[PDB]
RNA sequence: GUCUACGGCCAUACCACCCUGAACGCGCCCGAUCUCGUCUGAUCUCGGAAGCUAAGCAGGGUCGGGCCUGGUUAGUACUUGGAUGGGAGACCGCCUGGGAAUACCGGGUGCUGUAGGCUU
RNA sequence: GCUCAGGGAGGACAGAAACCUCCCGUGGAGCAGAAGGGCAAAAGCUCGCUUGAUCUUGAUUUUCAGUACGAAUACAGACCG
RNA sequence: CCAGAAAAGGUGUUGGUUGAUAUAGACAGCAGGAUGGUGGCCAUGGAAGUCGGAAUCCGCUAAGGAGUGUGUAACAACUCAC
RNA sequence: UCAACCUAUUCUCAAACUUUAAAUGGGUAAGAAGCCCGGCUCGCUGGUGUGGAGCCGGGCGUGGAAUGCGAGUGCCUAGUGG
């Protein structure tokens, strides 16, 4: 037995594609992950100018989105079924969050278009627990408290218990 | 070309250090301050002798290094190569200025930085030598030879402290047996009765 | 020669004291000032509006005018030969009451009360504050023991 | 032909010869600088 | 490794906020601009109508500030609405209107100005402002305190505001953020505001749920079913509540039951106890070590 | 005994970890039809009550860090005034008054105003 | 309405440094410039609406002779945001 | 004030501190021993204690250093510690 | 291993560093122009003859630390500005 207000549920599944150039391929990848998620994404602009990567300040270089709820669980399950339900334990952060990347987006189950091409994505799961809203509520903000945090071990036990995935070492 | 130290000998000015305002200071003559086997524990050298100054004067960095080498040469002759620890307890921070003429005169008289000079008080320790307790006369003799490199009057005082620590030499080994003091090299660590007692039980483990 | 800036030489004078930077406490904004109140000046760097000048920091004056955010006070500023009773507009958070009048007010209330009292009672009481007199005669009781003998220590050089 | 710049040497002696006297405060100080809406109210209260 | 950020020098140089800013409850920027009476007013009180929406009720107070604290003159809560006829639904917009009307008429009963300054007897939802009349004692004027509520349109804060204004308090406002003000064309129809004051969005949602999916209706509204509130009697129940509030708005205090003096929390440990604890801990450690030897 | 709402002074209140919370509260929580606002009802806004003290919060603990208040450091450092004092000087001693700060060692760990509960 | 500098742990290409997420973060950032002060639900950043950078008589401060100009401080009468 | 002097020294002389050793007979002084393993090992061209690098103990002893100096190509010779 | 790094310590500093923080010093107060009542006026402020301010009227002397001393005020003005 344990208090049911500590059931580890996902808070968000956030996705991005950092294409590193504006215009054609960026709007193309925006159409890609909008076709994936089902909601209009947003454009992340480049902070500082570096000549080594060919990006300048205030240049739109990435497309990201955050998904909540049942469709976040669906997109996570298809990303894990292309990653064969296996993760390295390097993917698990200190705060219990984890994430991975797919190298080409046809693999999730969307159909290829030669005008589009392929695009790789980063998926990142921020986990949670019923009660994390006090860290970002407006009126009476508090810190989360020490026994209510999610650790690396407690996150990977959640993964290998709920999705029946395997955590290969290294 | 360096002026005599009788010019730059009294504590005449407010302390004017190497900083964001005095740029282009030439580096100090002395840069080495500890000598001998400075990798020694507190346990193996109990004895400590101090060259203590007795006039409020200004010592130069070159005089500090000259007296340093003067003590080091005599104690590597006498106490062996690897049997003492010299520490120079004055770092030169007050920099000194020089008005050079070439015919402008005293118009716009503010000096370029020339050197660095330590400012010393009544009773400040200039050098301190830590060695074994039977090499007492060699401490006295080495610091007496090193006196002649400084201006003014300096005296010699063998302290009641155990080496380079702030604790008294008779009760030192009693406190290290009673574990209020922990050896950590040339110094010692003082353990109060105020921590969390996980540290207490890790000491008493 | 020195600059004639309005805030020259006030590096440590209008700065907030250690670990009490930040939002001004609101009792400062809630205190009410009548006219004729003796009031101290202490400028403050958190609000630049209505700053008293550096000649007046620590001077004490008297309110003659109260506006909706500021008070006008008459302070004595000493210039070279003469003392000018000059009037300045200070915003309300650079200013605070003085207890130097309040001690006299407590004393005048107390001695007028004990003048009302003990008048029909026949007695005559002291009202003027006499200064601290010399100590009158008194017996020092050495309860038993000898007084301890003190004598100077021999010199030892400790450094 | 230099000549010295600034001095405040004999000045305190010069001041205290005639004395630094405080400004002679007198009963019924004036009303210049008072809030003029308050002063309109005061003048009508004196009028009526 | 990493430099320890929260070190002892950090805790020496650290400066706390105010207590209510650390606890997050108050906003000292708006509080400073809100409560400070002008200095020529010379200790005239300046009143706030404080509205705070909690998860289960609605606090409506009025207050003027002093140097030792805020004096609450009159309070009116949402949980005392079953005294007047709203049995259930104590945190919606209509309950906000009711507790604003209650705070208003309760203060006017305290100040003896009930028959004077009737205000909106029947509701309209339109703009209203209590204009003070000559000869009689003037209107009570207080300014809204919303706190940390992000005041967009349709805020229950402004529902309690409309309740106090219709009860008869001269509060300065405007009909920009009552519900009904469409943002696209920038005008205010009062009938949408009357629907929100009479809870018709709640009744429409109730009819929506009982039309489309009944077990979700029991999941959403269950205490309405237990207090058998149907959508048709909703606005008539709120009109009865308004009539009863404007009839008798006094607050009678609950009598103080005499305590039995039982402490529910562990008291503060003393010096001899805690130094005895560490003596016992040292003794127990050394005996466990020597018998583990 | 204690909480809420508004607070005053703003660490004796903070920070890290642990134990316990009856009652009413305060919350977490369940949702998006309307008001409102987002890529996303996560936040803000709105409609509620199935579950829960897990977290916030409250109380307490830590030979706790900090902070506050003392003792020591020390009548030491510094210092007003004085000498046809000493010293080649640098500087130092005396007379008359004032008088500190670390390191080190103790104690303390929020008080409290207005309104309203709870402890039938 | 948000929080900054910096740092840790993660995440396809991606790295010392492109983008996403969490956590720490009393200012170690930023506020046009020189420095000093001041500032965290802001004075900083991002938005929305604007023109109090407007019309007008006195008082005062600053340098000061207790005169100007400059700059500034509370007011007061409008018209406004 | 102010009209001239320092570091450094002195077995001139006067005080003061601290530590030794001495009726188990000290410090001078005058006299007698100052020896064996052993000319110890590396090393040097030759280094016998006596230029140099580390060692640096025993026997016999009342006592004698694997040596304080003068020396010797190097021993011899002298001298000291004791 | 040797470096950087991190955690406890340690040696020495600052006119343009600072948590602390003196001595000397700088304002104000130490009453009759002050208290304590009563009543009017207001176009200012106002839940509230609210708040404040201005007025009138009356009563209070033990002149409210020491010390010392007659004060206040207005013209005209030389010399000085190494
Ligand atoms: Mg020469
Ligand atoms: Mg000089
Ligand atoms: Mg000349
Ligand atoms: Mg001249
Ligand atoms: Mg606000
Ligand atoms: Mg929600
Ligand atoms: Mg909880
Ligand atoms: Mg709990
Ligand atoms: Mg502690
Ligand atoms: Mg309370
Ligand atoms: Mg019972
Ligand atoms: Mg703001």
PDB file of N, CA, C and O in Angstrom, chain C residues 96-135:
ATOM      1  N   UNK C  96      11.737  61.126   9.264  1.00  0.00           N
ATOM      2  CA  UNK C  96      11.208  60.347  10.375  1.00  0.00           C
ATOM      3  C   UNK C  96      11.173  61.215  11.622  1.00  0.00           C
ATOM      4  O   UNK C  96      11.963  62.149  11.771  1.00  0.00           O
ATOM      5  N   UNK C  97      10.238  60.896  12.518  1.00  0.00           N
ATOM      6  CA  UNK C  97      10.030  61.683  13.725  1.00  0.00           C
ATOM      7  C   UNK C  97      11.245  61.648  14.642  1.00  0.00           C
ATOM      8  O   UNK C  97      12.085  60.750  14.579  1.00  0.00           O
ATOM      9  N   UNK C  98      11.320  62.642  15.512  1.00  0.00           N
ATOM     10  CA  UNK C  98      12.383  62.741  16.494  1.00  0.00           C
ATOM     11  C   UNK C  98      11.820  62.513  17.887  1.00  0.00           C
ATOM     12  O   UNK C  98      10.785  63.074  18.249  1.00  0.00           O
ATOM     13  N   UNK C  99      12.510  61.689  18.664  1.00  0.00           N
ATOM     14  CA  UNK C  99      12.125  61.403  20.036  1.00  0.00           C
ATOM     15  C   UNK C  99      12.690  62.426  21.008  1.00  0.00           C
ATOM     16  O   UNK C  99      12.366  62.387  22.207  1.00  0.00           O
ATOM     17  N   UNK C 100      13.523  63.336  20.503  1.00  0.00           N
ATOM     18  CA  UNK C 100      14.145  64.365  21.323  1.00  0.00           C
ATOM     19  C   UNK C 100      13.124  65.355  21.850  1.00  0.00           C
ATOM     20  O   UNK C 100      13.316  65.935  22.923  1.00  0.00           O
ATOM     21  N   UNK C 101      12.047  65.573  21.103  1.00  0.00           N
ATOM     22  CA  UNK C 101      10.941  66.344  21.639  1.00  0.00           C
ATOM     23  C   UNK C 101      10.073  65.487  22.548  1.00  0.00           C
ATOM     24  O   UNK C 101       9.514  65.994  23.526  1.00  0.00           O
ATOM     25  N   UNK C 102       9.991  64.182  22.267  1.00  0.00           N
ATOM     26  CA  UNK C 102       9.061  63.307  22.979  1.00  0.00           C
ATOM     27  C   UNK C 102       9.491  63.069  24.419  1.00  0.00           C
ATOM     28  O   UNK C 102       8.643  62.885  25.300  1.00  0.00           O
ATOM     29  N   UNK C 103      10.799  63.072  24.677  1.00  0.00           N
ATOM     30  CA  UNK C 103      11.262  62.937  26.058  1.00  0.00           C
ATOM     31  C   UNK C 103      10.881  64.158  26.890  1.00  0.00           C
ATOM     32  O   UNK C 103      10.439  64.027  28.039  1.00  0.00           O
ATOM     33  N   UNK C 104      11.021  65.350  26.307  1.00  0.00           N
ATOM     34  CA  UNK C 104      10.546  66.564  26.958  1.00  0.00           C
ATOM     35  C   UNK C 104       9.035  66.560  27.129  1.00  0.00           C
ATOM     36  O   UNK C 104       8.523  67.074  28.126  1.00  0.00           O
ATOM     37  N   UNK C 105       8.305  65.989  26.171  1.00  0.00           N
ATOM     38  CA  UNK C 105       6.851  65.959  26.289  1.00  0.00           C
ATOM     39  C   UNK C 105       6.400  65.030  27.410  1.00  0.00           C
ATOM     40  O   UNK C 105       5.473  65.359  28.164  1.00  0.00           O
ATOM     41  N   UNK C 106       7.061  63.881  27.546  1.00  0.00           N
ATOM     42  CA  UNK C 106       6.824  63.012  28.693  1.00  0.00           C
ATOM     43  C   UNK C 106       7.163  63.710  30.001  1.00  0.00           C
ATOM     44  O   UNK C 106       6.395  63.616  30.967  1.00  0.00           O
ATOM     45  N   UNK C 107       8.265  64.464  30.032  1.00  0.00           N
ATOM     46  CA  UNK C 107       8.657  65.137  31.265  1.00  0.00           C
ATOM     47  C   UNK C 107       7.713  66.279  31.625  1.00  0.00           C
ATOM     48  O   UNK C 107       7.413  66.473  32.807  1.00  0.00           O
ATOM     49  N   UNK C 108       7.199  67.013  30.633  1.00  0.00           N
ATOM     50  CA  UNK C 108       6.306  68.125  30.943  1.00  0.00           C
ATOM     51  C   UNK C 108       4.937  67.605  31.368  1.00  0.00           C
ATOM     52  O   UNK C 108       4.323  68.146  32.300  1.00  0.00           O
ATOM     53  N   UNK C 109       4.480  66.495  30.772  1.00  0.00           N
ATOM     54  CA  UNK C 109       3.248  65.873  31.236  1.00  0.00           C
ATOM     55  C   UNK C 109       3.398  65.328  32.648  1.00  0.00           C
ATOM     56  O   UNK C 109       2.510  65.528  33.486  1.00  0.00           O
ATOM     57  N   UNK C 110       4.551  64.727  32.950  1.00  0.00           N
ATOM     58  CA  UNK C 110       4.750  64.131  34.262  1.00  0.00           C
ATOM     59  C   UNK C 110       4.877  65.193  35.347  1.00  0.00           C
ATOM     60  O   UNK C 110       4.288  65.051  36.426  1.00  0.00           O
ATOM     61  N   UNK C 111       5.626  66.268  35.097  1.00  0.00           N
ATOM     62  CA  UNK C 111       5.804  67.223  36.183  1.00  0.00           C
ATOM     63  C   UNK C 111       4.603  68.153  36.312  1.00  0.00           C
ATOM     64  O   UNK C 111       4.317  68.640  37.408  1.00  0.00           O
ATOM     65  N   UNK C 112       3.836  68.355  35.232  1.00  0.00           N
ATOM     66  CA  UNK C 112       2.564  69.044  35.415  1.00  0.00           C
ATOM     67  C   UNK C 112       1.561  68.174  36.161  1.00  0.00           C
ATOM     68  O   UNK C 112       0.760  68.694  36.949  1.00  0.00           O
ATOM     69  N   UNK C 113       1.628  66.850  35.976  1.00  0.00           N
ATOM     70  CA  UNK C 113       0.761  65.961  36.740  1.00  0.00           C
ATOM     71  C   UNK C 113       1.138  65.956  38.216  1.00  0.00           C
ATOM     72  O   UNK C 113       0.259  66.013  39.083  1.00  0.00           O
ATOM     73  N   UNK C 114       2.428  65.915  38.529  1.00  0.00           N
ATOM     74  CA  UNK C 114       2.839  65.943  39.927  1.00  0.00           C
ATOM     75  C   UNK C 114       2.916  67.356  40.492  1.00  0.00           C
ATOM     76  O   UNK C 114       3.312  67.525  41.647  1.00  0.00           O
ATOM     77  N   UNK C 115       2.594  68.371  39.692  1.00  0.00           N
ATOM     78  CA  UNK C 115       2.300  69.704  40.197  1.00  0.00           C
ATOM     79  C   UNK C 115       0.824  69.867  40.523  1.00  0.00           C
ATOM     80  O   UNK C 115       0.481  70.571  41.482  1.00  0.00           O
ATOM     81  N   UNK C 116      -0.052  69.238  39.736  1.00  0.00           N
ATOM     82  CA  UNK C 116      -1.476  69.167  40.049  1.00  0.00           C
ATOM     83  C   UNK C 116      -1.646  68.383  41.342  1.00  0.00           C
ATOM     84  O   UNK C 116      -2.289  68.850  42.286  1.00  0.00           O
ATOM     85  N   UNK C 117      -1.066  67.192  41.387  1.00  0.00           N
ATOM     86  CA  UNK C 117      -0.927  66.443  42.619  1.00  0.00           C
ATOM     87  C   UNK C 117       0.086  67.153  43.515  1.00  0.00           C
ATOM     88  O   UNK C 117       0.896  67.955  43.046  1.00  0.00           O
ATOM     89  N   UNK C 118      -0.023  66.903  44.825  1.00  0.00           N
ATOM     90  CA  UNK C 118       0.936  67.358  45.844  1.00  0.00           C
ATOM     91  C   UNK C 118       1.023  68.881  45.917  1.00  0.00           C
ATOM     92  O   UNK C 118       2.050  69.451  46.283  1.00  0.00           O
ATOM     93  N   UNK C 119      -0.065  69.542  45.560  1.00  0.00           N
ATOM     94  CA  UNK C 119      -0.226  70.967  45.801  1.00  0.00           C
ATOM     95  C   UNK C 119      -1.085  71.224  47.022  1.00  0.00           C
ATOM     96  O   UNK C 119      -0.666  71.940  47.933  1.00  0.00           O
ATOM     97  N   UNK C 120      -2.278  70.636  47.062  1.00  0.00           N
ATOM     98  CA  UNK C 120      -3.114  70.611  48.251  1.00  0.00           C
ATOM     99  C   UNK C 120      -2.574  69.682  49.328  1.00  0.00           C
ATOM    100  O   UNK C 120      -3.028  69.758  50.474  1.00  0.00           O
ATOM    101  N   UNK C 121      -1.615  68.818  48.992  1.00  0.00           N
ATOM    102  CA  UNK C 121      -1.046  67.895  49.967  1.00  0.00           C
ATOM    103  C   UNK C 121       0.033  68.558  50.813  1.00  0.00           C
ATOM    104  O   UNK C 121       0.632  67.901  51.670  1.00  0.00           O
ATOM    105  N   UNK C 122       0.309  69.839  50.570  1.00  0.00           N
ATOM    106  CA  UNK C 122       1.173  70.642  51.407  1.00  0.00           C
ATOM    107  C   UNK C 122       2.639  70.564  51.056  1.00  0.00           C
ATOM    108  O   UNK C 122       3.374  71.527  51.309  1.00  0.00           O
ATOM    109  N   UNK C 123       3.087  69.455  50.481  1.00  0.00           N
ATOM    110  CA  UNK C 123       4.503  69.267  50.229  1.00  0.00           C
ATOM    111  C   UNK C 123       4.959  70.061  49.010  1.00  0.00           C
ATOM    112  O   UNK C 123       4.158  70.551  48.207  1.00  0.00           O
ATOM    113  N   UNK C 124       6.276  70.186  48.887  1.00  0.00           N
ATOM    114  CA  UNK C 124       6.933  70.890  47.790  1.00  0.00           C
ATOM    115  C   UNK C 124       7.913  69.908  47.166  1.00  0.00           C
ATOM    116  O   UNK C 124       8.803  69.394  47.850  1.00  0.00           O
ATOM    117  N   UNK C 125       7.759  69.645  45.885  1.00  0.00           N
ATOM    118  CA  UNK C 125       8.516  68.594  45.222  1.00  0.00           C
ATOM    119  C   UNK C 125       9.599  69.234  44.361  1.00  0.00           C
ATOM    120  O   UNK C 125       9.579  70.442  44.102  1.00  0.00           O
ATOM    121  N   UNK C 126      10.581  68.436  43.952  1.00  0.00           N
ATOM    122  CA  UNK C 126      11.618  68.922  43.052  1.00  0.00           C
ATOM    123  C   UNK C 126      11.176  68.743  41.608  1.00  0.00           C
ATOM    124  O   UNK C 126      10.719  67.666  41.220  1.00  0.00           O
ATOM    125  N   UNK C 127      11.312  69.799  40.807  1.00  0.00           N
ATOM    126  CA  UNK C 127      10.936  69.730  39.404  1.00  0.00           C
ATOM    127  C   UNK C 127      12.081  69.971  38.436  1.00  0.00           C
ATOM    128  O   UNK C 127      12.046  69.431  37.326  1.00  0.00           O
ATOM    129  N   UNK C 128      13.080  70.756  38.805  1.00  0.00           N
ATOM    130  CA  UNK C 128      14.233  70.976  37.952  1.00  0.00           C
ATOM    131  C   UNK C 128      15.145  69.764  38.033  1.00  0.00           C
ATOM    132  O   UNK C 128      15.407  69.246  39.121  1.00  0.00           O
ATOM    133  N   UNK C 129      15.612  69.304  36.878  1.00  0.00           N
ATOM    134  CA  UNK C 129      16.554  68.191  36.811  1.00  0.00           C
ATOM    135  C   UNK C 129      17.899  68.687  37.305  1.00  0.00           C
ATOM    136  O   UNK C 129      18.641  69.345  36.581  1.00  0.00           O
ATOM    137  N   UNK C 130      18.215  68.384  38.553  1.00  0.00           N
ATOM    138  CA  UNK C 130      19.560  68.634  39.027  1.00  0.00           C
ATOM    139  C   UNK C 130      20.518  67.661  38.348  1.00  0.00           C
ATOM    140  O   UNK C 130      20.141  66.530  38.036  1.00  0.00           O
ATOM    141  N   UNK C 131      21.749  68.084  38.073  1.00  0.00           N
ATOM    142  CA  UNK C 131      22.714  67.179  37.444  1.00  0.00           C
ATOM    143  C   UNK C 131      23.154  66.102  38.419  1.00  0.00           C
ATOM    144  O   UNK C 131      22.847  66.144  39.611  1.00  0.00           O
ATOM    145  N   UNK C 132      23.878  65.119  37.882  1.00  0.00           N
ATOM    146  CA  UNK C 132      24.342  63.967  38.643  1.00  0.00           C
ATOM    147  C   UNK C 132      25.295  64.406  39.747  1.00  0.00           C
ATOM    148  O   UNK C 132      26.413  64.850  39.466  1.00  0.00           O
ATOM    149  N   UNK C 133      24.885  64.298  41.005  1.00  0.00           N
ATOM    150  CA  UNK C 133      25.655  64.879  42.093  1.00  0.00           C
ATOM    151  C   UNK C 133      26.840  63.997  42.435  1.00  0.00           C
ATOM    152  O   UNK C 133      26.935  62.866  41.937  1.00  0.00           O
ATOM    153  N   UNK C 134      27.771  64.475  43.258  1.00  0.00           N
ATOM    154  CA  UNK C 134      28.792  63.575  43.792  1.00  0.00           C
ATOM    155  C   UNK C 134      28.174  62.562  44.738  1.00  0.00           C
ATOM    156  O   UNK C 134      27.169  62.828  45.398  1.00  0.00           O
ATOM    157  N   UNK C 135      28.780  61.379  44.776  1.00  0.00           N
ATOM    158  CA  UNK C 135      28.266  60.288  45.587  1.00  0.00           C
ATOM    159  C   UNK C 135      28.426  60.599  47.064  1.00  0.00           C
ATOM    160  O   UNK C 135      29.506  60.980  47.520  1.00  0.00           O
TER     161      UNK C 135
END
